[PDB]
Amino acid sequence: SMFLPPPECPVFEPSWAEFRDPLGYIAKIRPIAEKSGICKIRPPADWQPPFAVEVDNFRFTPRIQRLNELTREYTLQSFGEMADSFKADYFNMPVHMVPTELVEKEFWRLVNSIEEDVTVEYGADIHSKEFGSGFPVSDSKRHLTPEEEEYATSGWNLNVMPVLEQSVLCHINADISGMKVPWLYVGMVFSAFCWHIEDHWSYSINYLHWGEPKTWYGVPSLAAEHLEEVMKKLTLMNPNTLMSHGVPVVRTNQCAGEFVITFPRAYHSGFNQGYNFAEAVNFCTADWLPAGRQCIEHYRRLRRYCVFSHEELICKMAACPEKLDLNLAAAVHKEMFIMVQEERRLRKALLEKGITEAEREAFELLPDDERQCIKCKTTCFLSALACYDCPDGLVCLSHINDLCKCSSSRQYLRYRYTLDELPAMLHKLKVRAES
């Protein structure tokens, strides 16, 4: 049989009232939408931000994609001309007369076709800092119309959403670009993105500025490990293969002017129906905090580097309880409580090993490469073990036996807070959450 389209993902059409608070709205729809992993949001009809990129000074070198296996520079105009001619020539139809179902069926046939070499190009992962965002920004080099200044401050503006009140990553003001600053995607027909989840299992929000639709596939976070097991066992991967192995999949065609939200640890993939322009950014919420906690341990097991420290994030929020709504205060206290108990255990174990010397360290002021456990590559914040005779070495307190062979008298504790200081932080959170 030909490709079977998965069931359609949920589509949300917020009122103007609902639309005022993006993170509030997303929190509201989450119980339904997280059952699907992705969802589509259609803004009120007259919410229409003018495209802000200066088209004539936008240049890029797209990546080469051969469809059955997962280099000139272009301008936006010349990429589009190439894109349209390719589609019209391949389908032998007018460029805007090809049904999305037809493109979709042919895409998945091609991905699995060893004999045919269809190759396309994708302007993927373009920094919005390089040429500007698709959305207007306040401090722009462009004279903003009154209309554009309002869109510049909108919470649904992807430059603004990650620094909103209840956007948790705003508390880490280390730059960590790639998570806080939007990325651009210039697509042509068949240009694709493989199955993945976001850094630190964060949300992503995705907006299609213009062009032909972007076709999405999404998997609920609950089925994340099952998907990974199916892929390991049988091996990008056809959604039909996933569904026939017990993994739920949804689909959608994201049209111009529509948002797509990917929820924490929701696997997603897709391809573009034609020439288009999209913008995306990560964000993190109160309800994401447990996923963030778990992702650190997942990274640890994999010896992957962290973009940021979960410990540091929790403690920075805990230090300012009055900036937290009751939902966030509760979530932070939950995380903080077990962090403190683990730290009490780890420091006790350190004393039993014989280490007695200790120095206070403001880890958040160090570069990441001076913060990483040499064993599990995690970013230290609350504490670390170092050695006076081995200056390059550093381990987190979960790995005090993996620093060096020197005697206990030459090793010392580097700590952010004393054990005494931590109950006070917990108590302040608890009082706040009890308001």
Ligand X SMILES: CCN(/C=C\N(C)C)C(=O)CNCc1cc(C(=O)O)ccn1
Residue 278 lies near ligand X (rule: CB under 6 A):
yes
| Residue closer to Mn ion, measured from CB, 128 or 204 | 204
Cβ-closest residue to Mn ion? Answer: 204
* ∠ Cα 335 313 365 (to 5°): 140
Residue 214 annotated as binding? Answer: yes
Q: How far is CA 259 from the centre of its chain?
A: 15
Pick what 251 binds: Zn ion, Mn ion, ligand X, none; C-beta below 5 to 8 Å, kind-dependent: none
Residue 48 lies near Mg ion (rule: CB under 5 A):
yes
Q: Interface with Mn ion by CB under 5 A: which residues?
A: 204
Pick what 87 binds: ligand X, Mn ion, Zn ion, none; C-beta below 5 to 8 Å, kind-dependent: none
How many residues of this chain interact with Zn ion, rule: CB under 5 A? 11
Burial environment of residue 435 by CB neighbours within 10 A (0 to 12, 13 to 18, 19 or more)? exposed
In this chain, which stretch among 13-21, 45-53, 252-260, 381-389 interacts with Zn ion, using CB under 5 A?
381-389
- Closest approach of Cβ 124 to Mn ion, in Å? 11
- Identify the CA nearest to 118 among candidates 69, 167, 51, 171: 69
Q: Enumerate residues 6+ apart whose C-beta is below 8 A from 17.
A: none
Q: Which residue in the set 79, 185, 190, 201 belongs to the binding site for ligand X (CB under 6 A)?
A: 185
- Window 358-377: residues binding ligand X (CB under 6 A): none
Residue 327 annotated as binding? Answer: no
Residue 96 annotated as binding? Answer: no
Residue 310 lies near Zn ion (rule: CB under 5 A):
no
Q: DSSP letters of 298-359?
A: HHHHHTPPPSS-HHHHHHHHHT-GGGS-HHHHHHHHHHHHHHHHHHHHHHHHHHHHT---EE
Q: Which residue in the set 103, 281, 339, 350 belongs to the binding site for ligand X (CB under 6 A)?
A: 281
Residue 151 annotated as binding? Answer: no
Burial environment of residue 73 by CB neighbours within 10 A (0 to 12, 13 to 18, 19 or more)? exposed
Q: Residue 377: left (phi > 0), alpha (psi -120 to 50), or beta? A: left
CA–CA dist 276, 260 (Å, integer)? 15
Pick what 399 binds: Zn ion, ligand X, Mg ion, none; C-beta below 5 to 8 Å, kind-dependent: Zn ion
180-189 b/e with 16+ CB inside 10 Å = b? bbbbbbbbbb
Place of tokens 């495209």: 51
Binding flags for ligand X, 212-231, as an x/- string (CB under 6 A): --x-----------------
In this chain, which stretch among 75-83, 230-238, 277-285, 418-426 interacts with ligand X, using CB under 6 A?
277-285
- Identify the CA nearest to 396 among candidates 277, 280, 311: 311
CA–CA dist 171, 9 (Å, integer)? 32
In this chain, which stretch among 169-177, 248-256, 269-277, 402-410 interacts with Zn ion, using CB under 5 A?
402-410
Residue 255 lies near Mg ion (rule: CB under 5 A):
no
Pick what 178 binds: Zn ion, Mn ion, ligand X, none; C-beta below 5 to 8 Å, kind-dependent: ligand X
377 in Cβ contact with 364 (< 8 Å): no
Residue 193 lies near ligand X (rule: CB under 6 A):
yes
Binding residues for Fe cation: 196, 198, 268
Binding residues for 2-oxoglutarate: 122, 204, 206, 214
Q: Interface residues with ligand X (CB under 6 A)? A: 124-125, 178, 183, 185, 193, 198, 204, 206, 214, 278, 280-282
Binding residues: 122, 196, 198, 204, 206, 214, 268
